[PDB]
Amino acid sequence: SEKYFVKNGQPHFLISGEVHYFRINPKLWRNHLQLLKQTGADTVSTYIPWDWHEIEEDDFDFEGKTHPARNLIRFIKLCKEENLDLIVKPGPYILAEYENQGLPSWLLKKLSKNAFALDENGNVISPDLVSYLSDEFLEYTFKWYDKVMPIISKHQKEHYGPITMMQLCNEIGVFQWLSGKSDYNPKVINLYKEFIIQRYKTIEKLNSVYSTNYNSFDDLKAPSGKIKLRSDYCAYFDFHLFFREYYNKYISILKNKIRSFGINIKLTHNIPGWIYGNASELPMLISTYSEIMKNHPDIIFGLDHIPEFVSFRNAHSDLACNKILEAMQPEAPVWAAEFQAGTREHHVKAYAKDLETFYIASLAHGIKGFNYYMFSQGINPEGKGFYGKTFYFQTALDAASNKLALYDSIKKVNRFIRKEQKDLLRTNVNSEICVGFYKPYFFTELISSQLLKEKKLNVEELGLYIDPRFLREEILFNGLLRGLQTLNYNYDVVDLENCDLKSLTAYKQLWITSAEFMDAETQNLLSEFVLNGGNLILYPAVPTLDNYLNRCEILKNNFGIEFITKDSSHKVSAFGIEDVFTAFSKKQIYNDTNSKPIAFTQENEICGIRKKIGKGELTILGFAFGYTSDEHLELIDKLVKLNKIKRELFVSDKDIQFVVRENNKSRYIFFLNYHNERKTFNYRKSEEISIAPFSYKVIKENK
Amino acid sequence: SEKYFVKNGQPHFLISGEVHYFRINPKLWRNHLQLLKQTGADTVSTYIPWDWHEIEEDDFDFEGKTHPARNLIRFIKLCKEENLDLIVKPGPYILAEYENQGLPSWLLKKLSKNAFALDENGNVISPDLVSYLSDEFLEYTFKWYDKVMPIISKHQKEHYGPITMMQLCNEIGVFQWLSGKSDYNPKVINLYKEFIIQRYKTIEKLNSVYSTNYNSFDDLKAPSGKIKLRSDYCAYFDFHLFFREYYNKYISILKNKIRSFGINIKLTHNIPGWIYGNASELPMLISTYSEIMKNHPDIIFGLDHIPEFVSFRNAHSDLACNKILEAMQPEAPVWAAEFQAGTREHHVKAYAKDLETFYIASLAHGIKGFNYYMFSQGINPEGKGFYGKTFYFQTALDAASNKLALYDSIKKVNRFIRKEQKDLLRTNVNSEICVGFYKPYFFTELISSQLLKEKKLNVEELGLYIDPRFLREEILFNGLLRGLQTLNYNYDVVDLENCDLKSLTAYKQLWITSAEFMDAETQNLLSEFVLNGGNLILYPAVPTLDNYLNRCEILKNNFGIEFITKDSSHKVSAFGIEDVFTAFSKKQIYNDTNSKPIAFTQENEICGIRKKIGKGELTILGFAFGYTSDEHLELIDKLVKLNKIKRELFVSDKDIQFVVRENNKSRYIFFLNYHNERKTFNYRKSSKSEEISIAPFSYKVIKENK
Numbered sequence A: 001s002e003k004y005f006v007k008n009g010q011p012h013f014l015i016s017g018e019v020h021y022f023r024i025n026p027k028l029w030r031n032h033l034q035l036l037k038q039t040g041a042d043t044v045s046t047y048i049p050w051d052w053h054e055i056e057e058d059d060f061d062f063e064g065k066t067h068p069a070r071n072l073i074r075f076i077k078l079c080k081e082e083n084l085d086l087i088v089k090p091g092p093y094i095l096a097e098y099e100n101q102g103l104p105s106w107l108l109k110k111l112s113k114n115a116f117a118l119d120e121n122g123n124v125i126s127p128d129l130v131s132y133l134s135d136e137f138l139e140y141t142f143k144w145y146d147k148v149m150p151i152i153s154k155h156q157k158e159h160y161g162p163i164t165m166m167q168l169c170n171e172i173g174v175f176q177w178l179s180g181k182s183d184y185n186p187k188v189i190n191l192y193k194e195f196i197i198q199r200y201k202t203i204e205k206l207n208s209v210y211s212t213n214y215n216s217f218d219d220l221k222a223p224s225g226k227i228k229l230r231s232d233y234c235a236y237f238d239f240h241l242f243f244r245e246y247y248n249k250y251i252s253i254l255k256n257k258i259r260s261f262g263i264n265i266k267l268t269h270n271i272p273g274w275i276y277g278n279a280s281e282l283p284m285l286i287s288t289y290s291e292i293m294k295n296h297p298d299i300i301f302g303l304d305h306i307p308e309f310v311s312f313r314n315a316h317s318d319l320a321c322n323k324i325l326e327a328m329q330p331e332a333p334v335w336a337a338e339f340q341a342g343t344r345e346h347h348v349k350a351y352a353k354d355l356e357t358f359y360i361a362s363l364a365h366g367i368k369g370f371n372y373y374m375f376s377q378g379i380n381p382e383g384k385g386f387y388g389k390t391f392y393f394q395t396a397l398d399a400a401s402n403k404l405a406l407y408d409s410i411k412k413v414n415r416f417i418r419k420e421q422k423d424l425l426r427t428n429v430n431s432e433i434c435v436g437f438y439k440p441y442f443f444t445e446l447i448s449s450q451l452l453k454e455k456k457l458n459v460e461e462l463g464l465y466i467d468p469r470f471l472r473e474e475i476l477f478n479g480l481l482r483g484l485q486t487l488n489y490n491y492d493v494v495d496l497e498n499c500d501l502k503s504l505t506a507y508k509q510l511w512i513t514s515a516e517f518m519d520a521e522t523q524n525l526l527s528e529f530v531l532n533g534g535n536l537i538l539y540p541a542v543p544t545l546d547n548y549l550n551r552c553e554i555l556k557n558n559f560g561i562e563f564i565t566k567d568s569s570h571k572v573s574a575f576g577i578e579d580v581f582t583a584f585s586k587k588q589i590y591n592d593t594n595s596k597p598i599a600f601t602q603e604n605e606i607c608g609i610r611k612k613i614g615k616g617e618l619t620i621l622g623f624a625f626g627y628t629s630d631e632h633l634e635l636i637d638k639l640v641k642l643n644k645i646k647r648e649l650f651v652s653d654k655d656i657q658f659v660v661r662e663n664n665k666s667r668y669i670f671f672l673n674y675h676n677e678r679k680t681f682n683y684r685k686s687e688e689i690s691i692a693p694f695s696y697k698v699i700k701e702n703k
Numbered sequence B: 001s002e003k004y005f006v007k008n009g010q011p012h013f014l015i016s017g018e019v020h021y022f023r024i025n026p027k028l029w030r031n032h033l034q035l036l037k038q039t040g041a042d043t044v045s046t047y048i049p050w051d052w053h054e055i056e057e058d059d060f061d062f063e064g065k066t067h068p069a070r071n072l073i074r075f076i077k078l079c080k081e082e083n084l085d086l087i088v089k090p091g092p093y094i095l096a097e098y099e100n101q102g103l104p105s106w107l108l109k110k111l112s113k114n115a116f117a118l119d120e121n122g123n124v125i126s127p128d129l130v131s132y133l134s135d136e137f138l139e140y141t142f143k144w145y146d147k148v149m150p151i152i153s154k155h156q157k158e159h160y161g162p163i164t165m166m167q168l169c170n171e172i173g174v175f176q177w178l179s180g181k182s183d184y185n186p187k188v189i190n191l192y193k194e195f196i197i198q199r200y201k202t203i204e205k206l207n208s209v210y211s212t213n214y215n216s217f218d219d220l221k222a223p224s225g226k227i228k229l230r231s232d233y234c235a236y237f238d239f240h241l242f243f244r245e246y247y248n249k250y251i252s253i254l255k256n257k258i259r260s261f262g263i264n265i266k267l268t269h270n271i272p273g274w275i276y277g278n279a280s281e282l283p284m285l286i287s288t289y290s291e292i293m294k295n296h297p298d299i300i301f302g303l304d305h306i307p308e309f310v311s312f313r314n315a316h317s318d319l320a321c322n323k324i325l326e327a328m329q330p331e332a333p334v335w336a337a338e339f340q341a342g343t344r345e346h347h348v349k350a351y352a353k354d355l356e357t358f359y360i361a362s363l364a365h366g367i368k369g370f371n372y373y374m375f376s377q378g379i380n381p382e383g384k385g386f387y388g389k390t391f392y393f394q395t396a397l398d399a400a401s402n403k404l405a406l407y408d409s410i411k412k413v414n415r416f417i418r419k420e421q422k423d424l425l426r427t428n429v430n431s432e433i434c435v436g437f438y439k440p441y442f443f444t445e446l447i448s449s450q451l452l453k454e455k456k457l458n459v460e461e462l463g464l465y466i467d468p469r470f471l472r473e474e475i476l477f478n479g480l481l482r483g484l485q486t487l488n489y490n491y492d493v494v495d496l497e498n499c500d501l502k503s504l505t506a507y508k509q510l511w512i513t514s515a516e517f518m519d520a521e522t523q524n525l526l527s528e529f530v531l532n533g534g535n536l537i538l539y540p541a542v543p544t545l546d547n548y549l550n551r552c553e554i555l556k557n558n559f560g561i562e563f564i565t566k567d568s569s570h571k572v573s574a575f576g577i578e579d580v581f582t583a584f585s586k587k588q589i590y591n592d593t594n595s596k597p598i599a600f601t602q603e604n605e606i607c608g609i610r611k612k613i614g615k616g617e618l619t620i621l622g623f624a625f626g627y628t629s630d631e632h633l634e635l636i637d638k639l640v641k642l643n644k645i646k647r648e649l650f651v652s653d654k655d656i657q658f659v660v661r662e663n664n665k666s667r668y669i670f671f672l673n674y675h676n677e678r679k680t681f682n683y684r685k686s687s688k689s690e691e692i693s694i695a696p697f698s699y700k701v702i703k704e705n706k
């Protein structure tokens, strides 16, 4: 049933600690590895920075000849002597606050103009930022792989060495994201052209989808500027599809080159998206990897969790991210490639007592492995730090291997995990709620994001009112997912693309947060789901367009739905709940023939209905609510109770979060107190306990 | 000579609680007032919502004829009976999560399009957002004042009623700010044109300042779209000056109207700017009030503090905001018109254990009065709730007048304040550091802000590299002010406009965070300050332009500075601290003439110097640093130590914040732990050491008799 790492043919919780040899006094390398092993960690993780080892063009030092901390060979030997497995990450990009993001200075000085990412004007976006598929950049990357990969091959677990996993590059696309800007390098734009021709075959086919008027593919230009026309939305949508193929090509080139050295260990990649201690944009970033994950079943994606604190303000972020990774990668364990330990930022404090709770909550929220980032603080050698002298603060160990407060928290959590991993790794939550992941709503990193300065997407200019990023951030991430977690209802997330009908039928309810557009495949899937006996909850709109904003009303017509879009007060009543605040004046007003009306505008117009269709049930709400009032929790609760779904526990205090994890033999009840209040409460199945502020309690039951 | 409220010629700590009569069962009004009084609160505060009392056009109910909770008269009477003074806030805007922000539905339905705030295209920004000087808006506001003001007048203190203060409207500009669009209503356009003609007199004079070629004033439009030329920047700068005069006109019109009813009580206004539990944009909004605060000494501005949590993430916001209000309103006490009690929104928790610490920190940080907002929860009658039925959560009292957890925290704090107010209100901190408040850097709400939809200001397009909003947020608010508070160095903030040299010479150091532009008046003042014996710290730029980005090299010349702007690594060395990360590749490179070089680029070029000029000392750093690394705190500490400035206490844990307040008689030591760690530390006055244990997110106060 569950996916989990294995060691000695038993379920193994992967406990890795990040220790940057290149930022640590080599006299203290053994001491760091021993103190890490002494927490019950089984693995150590590090970058192998290209800049640090190719000290000049075609001058490699992996042996400490030119600086003791260039002795990668001895660090590998120390990992073996101290019985730690090793995760190695040779880039080419490492980021990691290393100057040039890990690329050599000699390389960046020597590359042509056309090797760099370019803005719509052909100007260099950043003196650190190459275009991934630059021939020059791949030439030098390959010459770097030519020296480091034989070292990694020799020490891989497949040759009985310590290296169990290797990360390819680092957070692909994170620069396109953090910078406003997309890459318009002429090589990238040529690949975009091949992609479009391959996709549409003829300009007449493209023209009928885009409503364009090209005489050939030679008239086709990469999209840029604000979207003003539906044709510009279409161009930008395919520009999004192209970049997912682009990142897949980049990672495929790295992988093929790696495999050519006989390296047969587990390959990895790491997902960015946390900022300011929430992860509402991480679903957009994980959507950029959609083609990699379809095409590479052997690359395990891990999450880069950066909570910064642990409270009701960010409690839902790590669960929603873990669940979305499970949706996109069901055949591999959910794990954190980077799992916050200390802080990257001196002024952004990371409290041991905060992180200890985050670690336990991560177990409740289904994590199967992590790498404490950073277990060990580093000191940047020879001004090679992007920022100051010091790399991370409030870690488990300082750069000189002094134990800090987090050390004892990590030892405590690891001791719990080692005691329980055999049973805990084989547990799941009983989810009767499925929440649909509709990937095209997330495909906006070029036109609409929290990090993009000027918005290229204003849906009002396209005759639309439901913005897909507002939907996926406020209605889905901070709304429905946050609400179900707060109400202690288990949900699973399912990717709707090429989705098996049989994999929706296990759930008593499927929840779809829908904009006005949705592809024919998904409209067909949801139609079949209800017709065959599924209970669907759909809001805030029955879709009437496809991803190209061409008419598509399959779901509408299959369900016998008619509506007019009409302006009204933001407040509606729904299931007898008065003053439900909704995001939009514009609401769908439903013909109620063969329907039960269950929501009403201030002027008593029908803005929600329930209906039987074939063997199934439909609940449509023509209005958008997130979680910004107690009425919103009341409405989510009412909806869940339409199909008689129960919480696993009665807990006397509604502000206590719990997760029940079980198999046939074992149950774990995780109680999580995300609040600055000592809480005393009791519980019983669908008895009294005190939890400190920002704290936890774990309870075992034999079934 | 602290500024504090006075009662019976004694120091009086203003303790108010907010209780919305219109959202509470009137059978429970008395119980809310009694329970508030029993916390030691002296005052109660409420809106009087226009929408609630003008139930239809020209149909008024202040007596509970149509709804018991419309009996404003009886609520006023109960405040008197329960020995509470009363703050009334009749709008016209109240916001307060009330439908249409307090404006009548019938009004918003009746008003013509020209009553509304309009974008650049002439479209309504929001259906509830009126243009402040709309003829139609002020006509209906006046008719609302015609009915509510005679009642307020009759129930003033001077007529033996309970009413001691009235707020004019609510957070002027907050609605425009949150909408992300500025008002281009034609009243605004026409008033701006009059402002520009009055300012420049002739199109030739405006052309010479802006470098434009207009044939007449008729060719000039209110600026719209992005700034691409220095002439666009000039136009926007005058538009900012115009908006400060526009808000002054609004509040003058309301004030003159109020005075005509024989209302002589203290008038208030309330400062917005906290969002997501920080206040780094509050300085921009308070700056929109600069002309109000110069023309109306009888209007007391108070802060609206919404911290939402109390941790290192936001510890610096309340002190910086208290200090900035003091800088702009030096003759009135610092007080909080709205002082967070519970939470306005269910999904953002307000813990008693956080807010109790915020209250104590506020005393440490010099607050002299506050109004707990919300003391009492409300339930919206008749669908009047903008966002839902319940108004506020986790308050002192639920809507039914049950005590909640916060009630005990407020009772504890108030008990300390009543015991200590006589000394505590007269206490000062010993600030040897003054930080300059240069208001023109904050004049960007039309072109650059956290909330503005459109980024109109890109200084690189003007041949500049120091963005004034980046400066005032990262280098000043989240940088220097945060770093000083974290290092436990007391600082004052002084408004540099029309600033007395006499009121800077008190300090050991004056710190100026400077962009490439600064007006002649300020450049001269800082010149005189150093020549006459002041110690100036100036970074990241010697300015060379005025506020219109024309040549002004007064300070550069007076200080005998030569510099070239050159690109280098972000990292510099300063005062022997290596790998100080700085914000810009571009830095000021100084030559070594009659100076001690104390900072060096990665190529060892001089990007900071110290020199003696007349009787004073100058330290210039040609690079930008806030507080984003440990080196930044080391650098701030090094700079403070240049003039032998010392902390009040040796404390063994550098992460403990403290404030020492004293007068002749009394010393209060405030310890604040903004961290999620139980801390055990020792301390001593810098003159055996005492041991203290402090819980997470907690406080200790020690009183000493001198």
Ligand SMILES: CCCCCCCCO[C@@H]1O[C@H](CO)[C@@H](O)[C@H](O)[C@H]1O
Pocket (backbone or CB within 6 Å): A095, A096, A171, A174, A175, A178, A179, A271, A272, A273, A274, A275, A276, A304, A306
């Ligand atoms: C545009 C300049 C890029 C330099 C910074 C790149 C790396 C910063 O670090 C990145 O920060 C993101 C935001 O918090 C996180 O989501 C990522 O996990 C993290 O690696």
Ligand SMILES: CCCCCCCCO[C@@H]1O[C@H](CO)[C@@H](O)[C@H](O)[C@H]1O
Pocket (backbone or CB within 6 Å): B095, B101, B126, B171, B174, B175, B178, B179, B271, B272, B273, B274, B275, B276, B304, B306
């Ligand atoms: C665009 C619609 C705006 C309607 C008015 C909403 C007023 C919300 O309330 C305001 O929020 C601000 C941001 O936290 C605070 O700074 C203010 O103090 C507070 O009054």
Ligand SMILES: [Ca+2]
Pocket (backbone or CB within 6 Å): A560, A561, A562, A591, A593
């Ligand atoms: Ca029908």
